[PDB]
Design a binder for this molecule. Structure first.
Ligand SMILES: CCCCCCCCCCCCCCC(=O)OC[C@H](COP(=O)(O)OCCN)OC(=O)CCCCCCCCCCCCCC
Ligand SMILES: CCCCCCCCCCCCCCC(=O)OC[C@H](COP(=O)(O)OCCN)OC(=O)CCCCCCCCCCCCCC
Ligand SMILES: CCCCCCCCCCCCCCC(=O)OC[C@H](COP(=O)(O)OCCN)OC(=O)CCCCCCCCCCCCCC
Ligand SMILES: CCCCCCCCCCCCCCC(=O)OC[C@H](COP(=O)(O)OCCN)OC(=O)CCCCCCCCCCCCCC
Ligand SMILES: CC(C)CCC[C@@H](C)[C@H]1CC[C@H]2[C@@H]3CC=C4C[C@@H](OC(=O)CCC(=O)O)CC[C@]4(C)[C@H]3CC[C@]12C
Ligand SMILES: CC(C)CCC[C@@H](C)[C@H]1CC[C@H]2[C@@H]3CC=C4C[C@@H](OC(=O)CCC(=O)O)CC[C@]4(C)[C@H]3CC[C@]12C
Ligand SMILES: CC(C)CCC[C@@H](C)[C@H]1CC[C@H]2[C@@H]3CC=C4C[C@@H](OC(=O)CCC(=O)O)CC[C@]4(C)[C@H]3CC[C@]12C
Ligand SMILES: CC(C)CCC[C@@H](C)[C@H]1CC[C@H]2[C@@H]3CC=C4C[C@@H](OC(=O)CCC(=O)O)CC[C@]4(C)[C@H]3CC[C@]12C
Ligand SMILES: CCCCCCCCCCCCCCCCCCOC[C@@H](O)COP(=O)(O)OCC[N+](C)(C)C
Ligand SMILES: CC(C)(C)CCN1C[C@@H]2[C@@H](CNC(=O)c3cc(Cl)cc(Cl)c3)[C@@H]2C1
Ligand SMILES: CC(=O)N[C@@H]1[C@@H](O)[C@H](O)[C@@H](CO)O[C@H]1O
Ligand SMILES: CC(=O)N[C@@H]1[C@@H](O)[C@H](O)[C@@H](CO)O[C@H]1O
Ligand SMILES: [Ca+2]
Length: 1056
């Protein structure tokens, strides 16, 4: 019965049968239970439970009163409750949600999965240290957010009560709301606040009603159906969690900037650094570390000739595009006829030399033969075979040894990843059926729904990639309850920060297992570089003061104009002195013998050319614009002058060499899928834009209805457009929308129809899964190479003294502060007056208790000894700080009111420093932070290279996108009042949003849209430069951040 191993196979068969019965559940067609199919399915489910209820009985009898066995017991008893409770209508359906755990029983039946899970469960205990750091971040930023922005997002511009009452009119809405309704609220700034958005910024009517919305008072709803707000600690953690995932975090920032103050970007910048970067990547560091701790044909010319035949054919395939000329189409087919014939000619020649048996011996020769038959078949059969022509690129593997070796390594990586992938599908399946139970037909239908298994799996996969996952969150919270946020928190936490970091650990472990004399002296002077470095910094200020809105006749323009001439002269003289002392190129140690010296030479050369053009009252405007773009690279001269920056830059370039082959393979995949996408989707990404298009079906009807026929910004018209779309897909920002266009594509001059071709999910999901694999091997390649480099390199006083030295006092304080932590979270918006008194009295008790601790500490150790410890200094600071805050509060109560409420608010917010005491107790957490401290010297320079990259692109963006405008005639999708390149200050802030990858694709869309005909000073070739600006910034910015993750990872390993 149980001894026979085939019994487990019988059990496994039933488990899979129980996975299918769960997958055929229809959310809102089975609840009625009135259909015949449901009736048989329920009987099927009952039969399955009988087996497992029986099987548990035999196992208990044979073995009597294994963690997995406990889980099996829990499923049976929970299911029995549901089955036995039948007949009671009180939350019967709600009890039916427990069956989603049944697929977990498959973990124990598969030995490979069980071992992997057991290893995973053994690493969780070491993640508590990271979990504590999460509590500090969420708790600290959860109160500061609540104390500041409690109830401010309810603000709306209301009509005056006297105005409406006296005039006896009520046709108007009570408060201003755009025609979109509550979906785009207009949050004003109260009179006592200094928010950016005021009730006087209301656009006029388009006699004027909008001018009478001039009262900003609290409304009755927060943004997103009440989902986003800081009214209490519960709602503040939902906002903070969304910021940590970097999805829609700018939207939350703009809400509080519009309501409280523009200087709230400091709060979010620290959160994105402390929590979103370090805290979330320390999870990867800890997991990865812990896992590791547990005759003519053979001629070279003939081979080269065949190589170029394949390569040229591949290039010819990617020259197609929309509205292709007829002659070009004919030429391509003729080219295909020639190339396939040439391959056929090689097919015959090799067969004769080696014979039919000899040819089959070579494995690659087999693949070549399979290609010739289809190529000839296509001609003889004269369109599905056309898409198969892309397999010809695989022939190049024969002649590329570096890539052939690399592909073997990647292919071998699938053996280790196979077990993890099976565990991931189970994780996605369980959460997919759970979502249908909770959000079944509740999203009244949105594309991101749980109405069926197919679209429940796609929505769960989409959430894991963190793309519009907050849009689904708001639907879930509004539809069922605000506590539905736990579904997304658990899905995103167990999935991204636990399971994905386990995949990284698997891969990392697998791979791991007379005048000239004067000049010669001056440049060699110790302070020469420092003197020059001062001038470079002053030249950076001049670059950062440039902006479009400078009046040419103002004194600022002439000041900037003159400063350029001086700096050009200064850097020419510095170059001139150096060349004299070293010689241009003739000498062995000549000036241009080093790349860094050469880099300067180009910069000085361009400056001189700029002067000449400026000297020339001629048609040289186009040239002037280009020189202005190259003049933003001047800050690059800082690297050579700073020894620390020079070393880190040289290290980043070296790190690229080990992963050079992966990048080449990744670049080849982009082209293969880019050409594939063009064939499928070229000419099908057009749509009719109008208020009502339910009757439009073709282009002609769109024109007849007097609407506009417009093309998507990201399309597959040609290989140029396809590569830009694939990069946006790979970046996982805006990748869902591009997928929707592919699904809805119908044909040329045809209106897209929703979910027209669901089979296109394979094209988009496959690209994301494969690319994410390549990008993961790049991270592992850098980690492995770095590790290789590291390896090769009085009686009344005595009683008090006993108490203070004893651990009892420390544990007593830790309890008091814990209570204060709970008390500090009791506050909320519009709390009852009784609570204010109760919380105030609690403050009195804590203040005196802390005061007694200081008094006892002083006597036990003494004034000089007590001040020695840093912890005691921290305690003194807060107690002094706490007394000051309470004193001001009492004066505020008193009749005298000279204290500005701003001071009282700041003191209340700064009272949270009491939590820092627990930092002393958490010995484990402090050690984890100490790992980051030891990595600061390596991480500090990487931060200097991050700010240097920001400066060059921030100044370059202002020159390019400085004058772009947003208006109702030319609406923008990514830019707004908060996101602009108007000045260097705004460009710097916008690039921070882009680096985090939050709606950075919408910003590029704004630069690709054609400028108005009437508008002037529009760059004709801006749409060509925008992809280069955003692609290079994204790749360079992400590489630097990855190397910061590796730097901390190395120190964690070498420390243990
Ligand atoms: C240290 C934390 C780390 C993880 C944080 C991740 C985010 C957690 C979000 C989960 C909490 C969701 C509840 C939020 C909330 O307050 O809303 C619920 C409820 C309003 O919703 P109704 O549908 O009942 O509307 C009623 C309308 N009158 O809010 C309340 O009224 C009070 C609920 C309790 C407030 C929160 C106290 C507990 C702290 C959050 C619980 C989550 C813990 C995470 C482990
Ligand atoms: C592994 C995942 C574990 C977490 C599970 C996540 C899902 C939690 C449950 C979410 C839904 C619970 C409420 C269901 C529901 O429909 O409630 C009805 C009621 C009113 O909402 P109407 O749907 O009628 O409104 C529609 C408007 N026309 O919802 C409530 O407000 C009741 C909330 C009760 C909370 C029960 C669960 C949390 C208990 C605390 C956990 C700590
Ligand atoms: C790489 C080499 C090519 C491998 C992929 C072969 C795809 C063949 C495409 C055939 C085709 O045109 O149909 C695909 C089908 C669309 O059906 P209709 O043509 O009836 O559409 C209406 C015609 N206007 O959709 C798919 O199945 C797309 C699958 C794409 C492959 C993605 C995975 C590649 C690995
Ligand atoms: C100087 C260096 C310039 C060249 C560097 C090329 C290799 C680095 C590729 C980028 C990378 O490794 O970054 C990883 C990044 C982070 O992934 P998340 O999913 O966490 O993104 C969070 C969103 N804010 O991944 C990407 O964003 C992928 C970018 C495209 C990858 C494909 C490019 C490979 C080359 C072709
Ligand atoms: C990248 C390797 C692996 C393959 C080679 C790819 C090329 C064949 C691609 C890259 C850029 C493509 C071009 C990008 C943009 C255009 C403009 C497009 O529209 C026009 O020519 C505009 C006409 C007008 O404005 O009047 C026609 C296709 C064409 C030339 C594309 C033809 C195919 C090109 C040259
Ligand atoms: C180390 C480098 C980056 C130098 C330090 C940076 C500064 C040069 C930046 C930071 C803040 C910037 C300022 C932020 C805000 C403004 C207002 C803004 O004014 C306008 O655009 C016009 C407003 C109006 O006319 O009402 C742009 C210029 C200025 C002074 C910016 C000029 C450049 C500043 C001083
Ligand atoms: C460690 C901490 C997080 C747990 C202990 C703190 C709780 C006792 C606090 C946290 C937030 C408080 C809530 C914040 C806001 C509200 C809403 C308030 O008004 C409403 O119920 C209206 C809600 C609406 O209109 O949406 C009633 C009290 C209540 C539930 C509070 C009750 C007490 C709560 C749950
Ligand atoms: C291989 C992966 C890592 C991507 C690498 C970057 C590409 C996404 C970039 C490199 C060059 C870019 C192209 C450069 C120029 C153009 C022409 C541009 O159209 C015009 O120039 C017409 C308007 C005008 O005349 O200015 C459309 C985008 C496109 C194809 C760009 C699309 C995005 C491309 C392919
Ligand atoms: C990572 C490290 C941080 C990166 C991002 C840092 C960004 C810092 C610069 C943040 C922005 O700095 C410039 C601001 O002064 C705004 O200048 P504006 O001219 O737009 O407005 C001036 C008037 N108000 C709006 C201030 C009242
Ligand atoms: C660059 C690195 C240092 C390696 C970290 C990058 N990662 C961080 C981030 C997550 C987003 N989520 C997914 O990619 C995803 C997709 C599926 Cl199907 C299942 C699961 Cl569990 C997760 C990525 C990639
Ligand atoms: C036309 C109109 O609405 N005027 C009102 C005025 O009556 C009111 O005193 C003031 C402050 O609320 O705001 C404005
Ligand atoms: C439901 C609906 O709008 N049907 C209209 C129909 O009345 C009209 O005759 C036709 C041609 O314009 O287009 C469609
Ligand atoms: Ca996004």
């Amino acid at each position: 019965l149980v001894c026979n191993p085939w019994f487990e196979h019988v059990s496994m068969l039933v488990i899979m049968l129980n996975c299918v019965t769960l997958g055929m559940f229809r959310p809102c067609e089975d609840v009625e239970c009135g259909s015949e199919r449901c009736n048989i399915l329920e009987a099927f489910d009952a039969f399955i439970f009988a087996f497992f209820a029986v099987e548990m009985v035999i196992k208990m009898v044979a073995l009597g009163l294994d963690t997995w066995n406990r889980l099996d017991f829990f499923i049976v008893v929970a299911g029995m409750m549901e089955y036995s409770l039948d007949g009671h209508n009180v939350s019967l359906s709600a009890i039916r949600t427990v069956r989603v755990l049944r697929p977990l029983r498959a973990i124990n039946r598969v030995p490979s999965m069980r071992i992997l899970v057991t290893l995973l469960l053994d690493t969780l205990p070491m993640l508590g240290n990271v979990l504590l750091l999460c509590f500090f971040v969420f708790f600290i930023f959860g109160i500061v957010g609540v104390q500041l922005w409690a109830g401010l997002l309810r603000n709306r511009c209301f009509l005056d009560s006297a105005f409406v009452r006296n005039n006896n009119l009520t046709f108007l809405r009570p408060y201003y709301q755009t025609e979109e309704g509550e979906e785009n609220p207009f949050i004003c700034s109260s009179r006592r606040d200094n928010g950016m958005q005021k009730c006087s910024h209301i656009p006029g009517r388009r006699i004027n009603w909008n001018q009478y919305y001039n009262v900003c008072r609290s409304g009755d709803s927060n943004p997103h159906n009440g989902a986003i707000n800081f009214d209490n600690i519960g709602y503040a953690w939902i906002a903070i969690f969304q910021v940590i995932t970097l999805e829609g975090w700018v939207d939350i920032m703009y809400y509080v900037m519009d309501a409280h103050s523009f200087y709230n970007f400091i709060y979010f910048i620290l959160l994105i650094i402390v929590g979103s970067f370090f805290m979330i990547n320390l999870c990867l560091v800890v997991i990865a570390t812990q896992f590791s701790e547990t005759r003519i044909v053979d001629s070279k010319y003939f081979s080269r000739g065949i190589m170029m035949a394949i390569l040229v054919n591949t290039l010819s395939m990617g020259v197609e595009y929309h509205e292709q000329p007829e002659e070009l189409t004919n030429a391509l087919e003729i080219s295909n006829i020639v190339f396939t014939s040439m391959f056929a000619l090689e097919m015959l020649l090799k067969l004769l030399a080696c014979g039919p048996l000899g040819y089959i011996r070579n494995p690659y020769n087999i693949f070549d033969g399979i290609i010739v038959v289809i190529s000839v078949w296509e001609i003889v059969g004269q369109s599905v075979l056309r898409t198969f022509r892309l397999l010809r690129v695989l022939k190049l593997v024969r002649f590329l040894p570096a890539l052939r070796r690399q592909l073997v390594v990647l292919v071998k990586t699938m053996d280790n990843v196979a077990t993890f992938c099976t565990l991931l599908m189970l994780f996605i399946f369980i959460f997919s059926i759970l979502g249908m139970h909770l959000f079944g037909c509740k999203f009244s239908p949105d594309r991101k729904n749980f109405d069926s298994l197919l679209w429940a799996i796609v929505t769960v996969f989409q959430i894991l990639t963190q793309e519009d996952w907050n849009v689904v969150l708001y639907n879930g919270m509004a539809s069922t309850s605000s506590w539905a946020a736990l579904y997304f928190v658990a899905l995103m936490t167990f999935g991204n920060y636990v399971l994905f970091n386990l995949l990284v650990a698997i891969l990392v472990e697998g791979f791991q297992a007379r005048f000239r004399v004067s000049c010669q002296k001056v440049i060699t002077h110790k302070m020469f570089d420092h003197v020059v470095l001062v001038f470079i910094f002053l030249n950076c200020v001049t670059i950062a003061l440039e902006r479009p809105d400078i009046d040419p006749g103002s004194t600022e323009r002439v000041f900037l104009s003159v400063s350029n001439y001086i700096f050009t002269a200064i850097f020419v003289a510095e170059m001139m002195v150096k060349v004299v002392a070293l010689g241009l190129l003739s000498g062995e140690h000549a000036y241009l013998q080093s790349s860094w010296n050469l880099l300067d030479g180009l910069l000085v050369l361009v400056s001189l050319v700029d002067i000449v053009v400026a000297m020339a009252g001629a048609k040289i405007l186009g040239v002037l614009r280009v020189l202005r773009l190259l003049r933003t690279l001047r800050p690059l001269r800082v690297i050579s002058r700073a020894p620390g920056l020079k070393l880190v830059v040289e290290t980043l370039i070296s790190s690229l060499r080990p992963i050079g082959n992966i990048v080449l393979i990744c670049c080849a995949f982009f082209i293969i899928f880019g050409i594939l996408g063009v064939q499928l989707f070229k000419g099908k990404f057009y749509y009719c834009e109008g208020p009502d298009t339910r009757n439009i079906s073709t282009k002609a009807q769109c024109r007849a209805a007097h609407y506009r026929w417009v093309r998507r910004k990201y399309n597959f018209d040609n290989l140029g457009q396809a590569l830009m779309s694939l990069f946006v897909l790979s970046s996982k920002d805006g990748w869902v929308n591009i997928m929707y266009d592919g699904l809805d594509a119908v044909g040329v001059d045809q209106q897209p129809v929703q979910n027209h071709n669901p089979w296109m999910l394979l094209y988009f999901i496959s690209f994301l899964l494969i690319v994410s694999f390549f990008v993961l091997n790049m991270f592992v390649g850098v980690v492995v190479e770095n590790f290789h480099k590291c390896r090769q390199h009085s009686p009344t006083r005595r009683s008090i003294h006993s108490l203070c030295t004893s651990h009892y006092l420390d544990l007593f304080i830790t309890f008091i502060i814990c209570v204060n932590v709970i008390t500090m979270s009791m506050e909320h918006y519009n709390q009852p007056k009784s609570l204010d008194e109760a919380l105030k009295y609690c403050n009195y008790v804590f203040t005196i208790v802390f005061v007694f601790e200081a008094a006892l500490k002083l006597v036990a150790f003494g004034f000089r000894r007590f001040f020695k410890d840093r912890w005691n200094q921290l305690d003194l600071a807060i107690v002094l700080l706490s007394l000051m805050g309470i004193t001001l509060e009492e004066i505020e109560m008193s009749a005298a009111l000279p204290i500005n409420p701003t001071i009282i608010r700041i003191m209340r917010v700064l009272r949270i420093a009491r939590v820092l005491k627990l930092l002393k107790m958490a010995t484990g957490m402090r050690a984890l932070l100490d790992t980051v401290v030891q990595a600061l010297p390596q991480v500090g320079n990487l931060g200097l290279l991050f700010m240097l990259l920001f400066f060059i692109y921030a100044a370059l963006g202002v020159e390019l996108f400085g004058r772009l405008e947003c208006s109702e005639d030319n609406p923008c999708e990514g830019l707004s009042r908060h996101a602009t390149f108007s000045n260097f200050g705004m460009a710097f802030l916008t690039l921070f949003r882009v680096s985090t990858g939050d709606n950075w694709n919408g910003i590029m869309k704004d630069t690709l849209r054609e400028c108005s005909r009437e508008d002037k000073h529009c760059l004709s070739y801006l749409p060509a430069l925008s992809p280069v600006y955003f692609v290079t910034f994204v790749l360079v910015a992400q590489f630097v951040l990855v190397n910061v993750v590796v730097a901390v990872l190395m120190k964690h390993l070498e420390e243990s």
